[PDB]
Amino acid sequence: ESLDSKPASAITAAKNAEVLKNLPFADREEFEAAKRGLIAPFSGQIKNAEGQVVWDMGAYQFLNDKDAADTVNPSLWRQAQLNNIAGLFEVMPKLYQVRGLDPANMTIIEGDSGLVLIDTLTTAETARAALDLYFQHRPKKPIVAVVYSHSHIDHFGGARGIIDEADVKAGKVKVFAPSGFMEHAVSENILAGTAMARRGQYQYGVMVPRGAQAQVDSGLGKTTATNATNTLVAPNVLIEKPYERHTVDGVELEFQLTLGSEAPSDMNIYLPQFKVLNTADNAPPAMHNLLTPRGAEVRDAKAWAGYIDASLEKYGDRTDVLIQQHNWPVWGGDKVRTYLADQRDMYAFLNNRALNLMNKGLTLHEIAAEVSKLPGELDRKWYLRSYYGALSTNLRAVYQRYLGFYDGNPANLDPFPPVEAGKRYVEAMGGADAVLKQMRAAIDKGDYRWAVQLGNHLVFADPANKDARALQADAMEQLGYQTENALWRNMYMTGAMELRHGVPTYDSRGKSEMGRALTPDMFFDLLAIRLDTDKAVGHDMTLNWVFEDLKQDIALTLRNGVLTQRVGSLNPKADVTVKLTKPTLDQIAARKLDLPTAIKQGTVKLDGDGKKLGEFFGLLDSFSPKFNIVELEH
Amino acid sequence: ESLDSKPASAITAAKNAEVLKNLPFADREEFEAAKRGLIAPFSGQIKNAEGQVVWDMGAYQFLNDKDAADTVNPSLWRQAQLNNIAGLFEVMPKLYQVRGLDPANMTIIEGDSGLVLIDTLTTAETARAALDLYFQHRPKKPIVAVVYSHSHIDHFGGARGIIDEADVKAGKVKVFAPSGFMEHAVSENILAGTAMARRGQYQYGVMVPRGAQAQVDSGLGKTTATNATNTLVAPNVLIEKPYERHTVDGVELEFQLTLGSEAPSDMNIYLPQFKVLNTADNAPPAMHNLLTPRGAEVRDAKAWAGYIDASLEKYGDRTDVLIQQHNWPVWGGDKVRTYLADQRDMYAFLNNRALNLMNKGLTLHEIAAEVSKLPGELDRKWYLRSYYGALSTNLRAVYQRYLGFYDGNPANLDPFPPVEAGKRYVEAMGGADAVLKQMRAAIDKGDYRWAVQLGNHLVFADPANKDARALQADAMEQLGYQTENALWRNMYMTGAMELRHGVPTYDSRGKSEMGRALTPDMFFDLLAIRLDTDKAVGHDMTLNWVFEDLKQDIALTLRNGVLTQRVGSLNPKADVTVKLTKPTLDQIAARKLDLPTAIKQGTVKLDGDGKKLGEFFGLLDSFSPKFNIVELEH
Ligand SMILES: [Zn+2]
Ligand SMILES: [Zn+2]
Ligand SMILES: [Zn+2]
Ligand SMILES: [Zn+2]
């Protein structure tokens, strides 16, 4: 049995051929929108300080000006080509977008004395790349204001690389965000972060080769940046009212809090002077995720559609062009009004149809099966295709949000873990060789869907079964070939790759400098997750922390192996008090500063049982960002 | 194959005998707390207008002063025995509680001139019955104020039976609520209502007969009311700040907002005069659900633990007795502080341990299997047992909250619907007879857990297979006999019953009057759900609605078979304009008033396409509330 990337099968290639028939020949239209406004194209490479490639558009050369392979769905192929159109873009004078040098875009407005920015890109390396391309056709000006459209890494991540941390702590540089920015940014990207990062490797297929048999696109971009630095710098102006007009450096900004939609903290941005609406990530030219593959809190389709409807109302007529922080803009008032209404109708449908079926008694997989397409004319639009988010996932995601993972059927109340259930299903079907045969029968029958369900149990029951991995991976690869959904493809490809070759060595949050923005309370929130309950039981203790610089007081309490904290108080009878400053912690947190060293320097002062601090730090786990996904631990 | 309720199996009874030894012997402590303050006991019946029974405590007589049967887990039997302690209780002079006439409790505070209430129970009938019992021992006074402690039907559903709609509308009776009450109460109980009510039939085993081989208790109560009226009356004063003091009828009320925890809209109530804390449903004497079986939004254990630690800090030192809106109070400051400390550690642990393992790479069923108990002394407390919420469910609920239903493994990206998967697995195992063989072997082995997974496949493949159904029911029954979890037992019993004798004809929301509180926007949010998209595809149209009494305008738009709405505006080019009143709408809504009848009456003015209004109402589906759960749909 082979561990090589197989070609498209008879059945795969045919399925893809059929798609050519079913796709509407209203082509070129969108291509015209992709290309319009282009100044300096980019098809090169971006490197970090050590010389490693962080972004590389050149690897996608194969998509360009060619027809679709059988190893790719034609619809996705098209979308993949569109995201290939990258570089520097003029919308209107004084208004620029840098596309295809990050999964995200960067919108820069040429202010009076300086510059106003919308979004910082994913990484400090891409951000400075973006600006570098800008300054190369436009005059050099400093940065007066930055706009975080949402609490998403691909937008706040490139921050520290283009703006100084202290100009924001002082106020010389104003930074605009949505309400509850910091609390949600740190949850998604830090508190469940190790899981999120690793699952994310599947979402964008980051370690998967770029080719027609492998990695082609990520729907709203190509993929993400590799071996680069995730930064985080907290905002100084928190927009908390539903609408707000602010003015800075001679630019008028109309903000629309779209909280709870695409991000838990998210806002749109309108520019009166230009007659332009920035929907951020709220209306991309592809169905978005209500539940992201990397893992996040479910999003609200209902609120999502209302916010789009609000945009359509409040700015629908006074807009000539709509620009987003992902993909190309849409030109002409008529077209934006139609676009937004279709976008609204989409998310509204997801919510309403799912809720319709729920009250009809359908369970999440039933619903996903029963709704095969968007209703009416929404089906025929290129910008509502399941390229990023899946109609199916999204329908399940509504059931999740309103009712949960449990389907109501007591037979699904307490499912067996994958290893347990695998072993039992294999036995039930006659053992390894019996299922292997059934797998082959299904791969020949071109039922790759069932083959993976079959193979999954087997690989989990016996991960040493080399013929099971090879088969499972082939079945997945085929599913990746057939799928319209750029994200699904990435996941099926990364699946196959890791079934075959194991888990590659790479940390998504290796270079990360996001722990700088962490307040002490967010830090101890992290330590609570880090703490090993089982070891910690028996070692009950209380710890006082006084942050002399921030004049902050936190009371940590470890009881029954559970860690809890009180911000703004101190326990009198605490076992130890730790007097220090934010930066001192910062270096203990990034492992720069040795425990016994710190006490000698005078940088950490102790009152009580010092051996308690040491023993408390001993009780912390560290998380490997390199865990198994398609086979069992470790 | 038999369809009768089977007795305990040798392994089941054995398992249940072992519980006796491992349960802590410090019984009686909890009984003394439940009995304390009892004035008037209740074991009676409560009946509706048509004389049907809505609530019967005497049905549980079998539990009283008797030892546990082999068909019920001893720990649960204890819990059941405590929930049998029902009636009117004095907490302190001027402070009374009505327990065990409803799944929830009623707190009654005697004021300067009238009565201050906390929660109104589930139904008009029970609520009236609670006040009867009170007035039978305390002086008849009017209700001056009501407090909705959270947006759960067991706390707001009985309001209309005891206070007047227009009195609240005017401001004579102050009704307090936590921020966003209406929004979340109408969402959970009306928008997703038919699903939630039916799934709720399982959660409380409503149609399951009460006895040792069937229904016995529901953790924080016995069950819910049957054949009763759910009401809803919108509050007039909303608590928006984290803490608020209010004095009404000479009663000092401190509110602590605890939004996101047990309920989206939720708060605690401190009574400084008394030195008592009402923790509503935030600290019941049992683990609570982070994800409820009936179905609702996931709950935030992190917040949950945080709010408790807040109560502990801000009220723990000035609290002599803690009272709850379910179960008995806890007496003694030292005891309440221990109690709240333990409860906080619990929800903190749930969140933190799950998140720990998540970052370690474990999936939801893996973490469920890995964590078998609460840590340290938390395991040893009666008030933290999984009687209501399950430890496994809650662990899975943390996974759901932060990551979602998808485990990251692409094999599980696109699962088959129950029927599809069932037919395939059955085939893969060698068809009905072969799987029935395997089922039989599993029941003999005492593997009731595996049996139900096996049988579910079969029953869904062919719901006419009476052996399958009968076996699956027996296995479900044993699982029910074994479980400590009141909710799970209910679910397993209801399932076994419906597998055997089908779904009985009962509407939980039969007498419901919750549509009366619905404002027009709410009513249209409901219609968009009710709308049949396939049908309404092709009938695109626009409707203006003007509410003469409310002075409110609503712009309905139906596009691509999807219904959206705009509040505060009218579209000038609408196919029709309707000018009416809220009462008028209600009567058409409750089906009491025909369409053409109303038009004639002058209560409904049309402006445009008259035919259109008719063709719009004929596009809405009706939900049957009797859908199958343990087998595929009708
Ligand atoms: Zn985003
Ligand atoms: Zn983005
Ligand atoms: Zn509740
Ligand atoms: Zn309750």
From Swiss-Prot, chains A, B:
EC annotation from Swiss-Prot or TrEMBL: 3.1.6.19
UniProt effect for mutating H288A: 1300-fold decrease in kcat with (R)-2-octyl sulfate as substrate
Temperature optimum or stability note: Is very stable at 20-30 degrees Celsius.
Example of a GO biological process term: dodecyl sulfate metabolic process
Any one Gene Ontology molecular-function term assigned to this protein's record: protein dimerization activity
Residue positions binding Zn(2+) 1: H150, H152, E262, D281
Record note on what altering Y388H does: 238-fold decrease in kcat with (R)-2-octyl sulfate as substrate. 13-fold increase in Km for (R)-2-octyl sulfate
Pfam name, any one: Alkyl_sulf_C
SMART domains hit by this protein: Lactamase_B
Keyword Ion transport included in the entry's annotation: no
UniProt KW S-adenosyl-L-methionine keyword: no
Annotated binding of sulfate, by residue: Q203, N289, L290, L291, T292, P293, R294, R299, Y388
SUPFAM superfamilies from the UniProt entry: Metallo-hydrolase/oxidoreductase, SCP-like
Binding site for Zn(2+) 2: D154, H155, D281, H326
Annotated InterPro entries: Alkyl/aryl-sulf_dimr_sf, Alkyl_sulf_C, Alkyl_sulf_dimr, Bact_Alkyl/Aryl-Sulfatase, Bds1/SdsA1_MBL-fold, Metallo-B-lactamas, RibonucZ/Hydroxyglut_hydro, SCP2_sterol-bd_dom_sf
Keywords: Hydrolase, Metal-binding, Signal, Zinc
Catalyzed reaction equations: an (R)-secondary-alkyl sulfate + H2O = an (S)-secondary-alcohol + sulfate
Top EC class of this enzyme: hydrolase
Note in the entry: Is a very useful inverting alkylsulfatase for the deracemisation of rac-sec-alcohols via enzymatic hydrolysis of their corresponding sulfate esters, which furnishes homochiral products.
PANTHER family in UniProt: ALKYL/ARYL-SULFATASE, ALKYL_ARYL-SULFATASE BDS1
Assigned protein family: Belongs to the metallo-beta-lactamase superfamily. Type III sulfatase family.
Record's subunit section: Homodimer.
Function, as annotated: Alkylsulfatase that catalyzes the enantioselective hydrolysis of secondary-alkylsulfates with strict inversion of configuration, leading to the formation of homochiral (S)-configurated alcohols and nonreacted sulfate esters. The substrate spectrum includes a range of linear, branched or cyclic sec-alkylsulfates. Can use sec-alkylsulfate esters bearing aromatic, olefinic and acetylenic moieties. Acts by cleaving the C-O bond, resulting in inversion at the carbon.
Entry protein name: (R)-specific secondary-alkylsulfatase
Species of the source: Pseudomonas sp
Native organism taxonomy: Bacteria, Pseudomonadati, Pseudomonadota, Gammaproteobacteria, Pseudomonadales
Gene: pisa1
